[PDB]
């Protein structure tokens, strides 16, 4: 949902007030991705156990 998927481009493009907004959208999405990844990995690890 951000303008770009690269944090360097965001930093080099937008001023802080909008840079934090874009980086926060990126963190939100990417952290949801990693949260689902860890939950699936924990379920898989329980199965392996």
């Amino acid at each position: 949902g951000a303008i770009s998927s690269v944090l360097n481009d965001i930093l080099s493009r937008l001023d802080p007030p909008e840079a934090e907004v874009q980086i926060d959208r990126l963190i939100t999405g990417r952290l949801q991705s990693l949260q689902t990844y860890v939950t699936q990995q924990l379920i898989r690890a329980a199965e392996i156990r």
Binding site: I3, S12, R13, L14, D15, E18, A19
Partner: protein, 97 residues
């Protein structure tokens, strides 16, 4: 683009190609020329710091009250008929008296 003697109408807005040249926008902040200056997809001060690939300019003149509706996704008598900006538009908007 900026200092041209006569811009074209918004009905027929000039199609300008800017390439193979150095883009320096510190002139706006190095001299009080334009009253209104804003950027949406980038920072006003980082335009010189960050280098783009194909920079393009669009020149047109509209009524003062019609300036507020010149932005991504805007709707109105000017936005939806003659000149409009993409919702995901990445660029800056410049206006002066």
């Amino acid at each position: 683009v900026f200092n041209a003697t006569r811009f074209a109408s918004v009905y027929a807005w000039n199609r300008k190609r800017i390439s193979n040249c150095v883009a320096d926008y510190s002139v706006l902040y190095n001299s009080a020329s334009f009253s209104t200056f804003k950027c949406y997809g980038v920072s006003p001060t980082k335009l010189n710091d960050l280098c783009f690939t194909n920079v393009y300019a669009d020149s047109f003149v509209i009524r003062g009250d019609e300036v507020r509706q010149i932005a991504p996704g805007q709707t109105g008598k000017i936005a939806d008929y003659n000149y409009k900006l993409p919702d995901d538009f990445t660029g800056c908007v410049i206006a002066w008296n």
